[PDB]
Structure 1
Amino acid sequence: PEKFQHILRVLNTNIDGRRKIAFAITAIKGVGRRYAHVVLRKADIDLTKRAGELTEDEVERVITIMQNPRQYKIPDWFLNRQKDVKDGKYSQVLANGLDNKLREDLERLKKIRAHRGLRHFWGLRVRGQHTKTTGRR
Structure 2
Amino acid sequence: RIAGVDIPREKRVVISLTYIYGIGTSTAQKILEEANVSADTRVKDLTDDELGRIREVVDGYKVEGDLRRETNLNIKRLMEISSYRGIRHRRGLPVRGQKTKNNARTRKGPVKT
- AA partner of residue 107 (structure 1): K
The residue matched to 1:13 in structure 2 has which SS? coil
RMSD over equivalenced CA pairs, Å: 1.6
- How far residue 39 of structure 1 moved from its aligned partner, in angstroms, is 0.3
Q: 1:20 and 2:12 equivalent?
A: yes
Aligned to 1:55: 47
Q: TM-score, normalised by structure 1?
A: 0.69
- How far residue 120 of structure 1 moved from its aligned partner, in angstroms, is 1.3
The 2-side partners of 1:56 and 1:118 are apart by: 49
The residue matched to 2:6 in structure 1 has which SS? strand
- CA contact 1:16–1:50 (8 Å) conserved in 2: no
Residue 132 of structure 1, aligned match among 72, 84, 101 = 101
Q: 1:105 and 2:66 equivalent?
A: no
The residue matched to 1:12 in structure 2 has which SS? coil
Aligned to 2:108: none
Gaps of 5+ in 2: 106-110
Aligned to 2:63: 94
Q: TM-score, normalised by structure 2?
A: 0.82
Pairs aligned (count): 106
Identity of aligned residues (%): 30
- CA contact 2:3–2:58 (8 Å) conserved in 1: no
Aligned to 2:57: 65
- CA contact 1:16–1:24 (8 Å) conserved in 2: yes
